[PDB]
Symmetry: C2
Subunit: 310 residues, 2 copies
């Protein structure tokens, strides 16, 4: 029917079967680029705002404040515009002019912090702003807010169930906040009762989930897979529902995203390439031959125009 604002238009994203990956069509992708603001983080922008409203922490006149380097800022920006909230986002001054223009265009009050301080500096400044009038400001905290995996339990997971008629056997998802793999997994395992294999994907350059689960020193490192590999275990990653962790390198992520574009006609982001590369490895193991593998593509590639992708 007719959505009351664009926040309600999230999800119902398509599944497409891959032709040049997997073995006999065993790899299927969920195109979260096919969403408002071009990414999966429209679902959490919407639901974190919605839950804050229901719980009375976000009310008429209060202002959203958060620190955002990626897609959640774009998501919160469109949700705040659609629902009529002022919003201030902090981010380092190093951010691209194009991102700043997009955010400015969405009506955000942009507070640029010192370049040297990176994300710690922006998170600091956001917290500082909230401290300055905690009755005025609400910080939604995507790495810890349960409304993040909750929306994936209510929407993303049930969409995979329904569109595969319950035949999904494996879910492959890169982990940034962990919300996607957590909610999807809880839906399918707990609410639909199917003992699928849930596969976290992280960069080989920063394999903190693998290291954690091995009892090894956690050694984060730099990499180019935007949106994943935060270098710590976020509160919104439920390690209990993770069955396997696959590591992917940045070069192969990129190369895989390029192949999705050139060979499948799917315009997805670098982290989409990382997820597909991990899924293709599993898909070519005889143990996964008769299994339906659903892979989350978090974002679209026209958002990666000025990046190593293109």
């Amino acid at each position: 029917a007719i959505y009351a604002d664009n926040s309600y238009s999230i999800g119902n994203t398509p599944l497409v079967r891959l032709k040049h990956f997997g073995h006999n069509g065993n790899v299927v992708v969920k195109i979260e680029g096919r969403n408002p603001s071009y990414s999966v983080k429209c679902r959490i922008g919407a639901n974190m705002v919605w839950q804050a409203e229901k719980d009375g922490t976000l009310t008429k006149g209060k202002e959203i404040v958060d620190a955002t380097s990626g897609n959640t800022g774009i998501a919160l920006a469109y949700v705040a515009a659609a629902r009529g909230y002022k919003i201030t986002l902090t981010m380092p001054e190093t951010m691209s002019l194009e991102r700043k223009r997009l955010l400015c265009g969405l009506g955000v009050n942009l507070v640029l912090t010192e370049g040297a301080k990176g994300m710690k500096g922006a998170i600091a400044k956001a917290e500082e702003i909230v401290a300055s009038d905690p009755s005025r400001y609400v910080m939604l905290k995507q790495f810890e807010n349960p409304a993040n995996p909750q929306i994936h339990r209510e929407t993303t997971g049930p969409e995979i169930w329904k569109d595969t008629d319950g035949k999904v056997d494996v879910v492959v998802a890169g982990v940034g906040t962990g919300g996607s793999i957590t909610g999807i997994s809880r839906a399918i395992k707990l609410d639909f009762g199917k003992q699928i294999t849930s596969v976290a994907v992280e960069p080989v350059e920063s394999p903190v989930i693998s290291q954690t689960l091995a009892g090894e020193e956690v050694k984060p490192g730099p990499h180019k897979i935007q949106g994943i590999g935060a270098g710590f275990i976020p509160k919104n990653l439920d390690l209990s529902i993770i069955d396997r962790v696959e590591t992917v390198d940045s070069d192969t992520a990129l190369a895989t995203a390029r192949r999705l574009m050139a060979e499948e006609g799917i315009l997805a982001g670098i982290s989409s390439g990382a997820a597909v590369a991990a899924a293709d490895r599993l898909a070519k193991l005889p143990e996964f031959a008769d299994k339906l593998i659903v892979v989350i593509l978090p974002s679209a590639s026209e958002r990666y125009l000025s990046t190593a992708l293109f």
Copy 2:
């Protein structure tokens, strides 16, 4: 369920009710940016290829050749990648580096023509290529190919009918090829039998439909509303089903698109602003007060990052 390739994922785009335009919620937008390749022209890229296959003009091994300055080239490029066709697109060398990179990334053979010749030069070169081996090449010709409005009759129109439960009274659409207003209108008027008002939108700078229908000299002119105002009456515009023509200026198109972003949280292209501006004019006339106005937003704005929009 699961699409066999990304060509089949077209459409089922959302309707969102506007909060800061119209009068008591009478203006609703159809967000065709929520499509593969970010625009409405994924529907015609898909169906022109599909029809050419069914009619035996496009077969295994034959190459798509066309001349494209806008969104249809991006559409044909993703469809050709998804379905496994080679494709050559011609376009003037003046085109943006970003568009060229996108198209190169989609696997297109890009043939850049002389800048001075603009689109006539590219259309020439495409025709020249087809002439060089007409058994090898297929040019799909979006301004004349009936498969363009046919896909809108089969999909876009029926989606508006269903999502409004038949209550749509007015369709407002900018005209580039005319396919969208033609097919949508034929669907609703002919197949569902409702005598709605079909409104073409064109630039005030190049009001060739208005001039034509007035019996006046046709005087095209330059403007900035990308995707509409081709400066002629295309074969795919069925003037018989047009009830009214509204003209919109480029500055107000832009300003309207900016307002959609800032005030509604909808990221749409300049021609989306032109369509909304025309629809808002109609919506504030007492004759349209009790009428449901559905407005087509052809494309998304992250494709308009480096443009007057941002």
